[PDB]
């Protein structure tokens, strides 16, 4: 990229997303500043590349104590998912969100997984 700049989390999130995954992304423009806000309320003094374990989490637990606690879990896979494509990208190196919320009540089965092959632009 010419202009250097913008490798943020922020950007990083639009590079999966311009495939087209989910829908609602023309509302996201005006929302990114409610989300980046209450995304990371503790956690904003904190470069991309130093990112750390479920301990930043509690923040999140907050919402989740006002009885909304399904946007947390809704919230939380953006920062799963996304650590995901930087350790495919490898410029983390380390996988600090190892789990991140792993199970939250009621677990599935998950009979013959899908979720470990994709590729596809």
Known sequence: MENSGAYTFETIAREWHESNKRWSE?????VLRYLELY???????????????????????????????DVAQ?????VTAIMRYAV????????????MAGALSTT???HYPL???????
């Open 108 to 110: 599935k089965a998950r």
């Open 26 to 30: 023309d509302h996201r423009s005006r």
């Open 88 to 99: 495919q990208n490898d410029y983390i190196d380390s996988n600090p969100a190892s789990d």
């Open 39 to 69: 995304i990371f309320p503790h956690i904003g003094s904190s470069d991309i590349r130093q990112l750390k374990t479920s301990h930043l989490l509690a923040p999140i637990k907050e919402v989740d104590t006002s009885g909304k606690h």
């Open 74 to 78: 809704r919230l939380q896979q953006r």
């Open 115 to 121: 979720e470990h092959h994709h590729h596809h632009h």
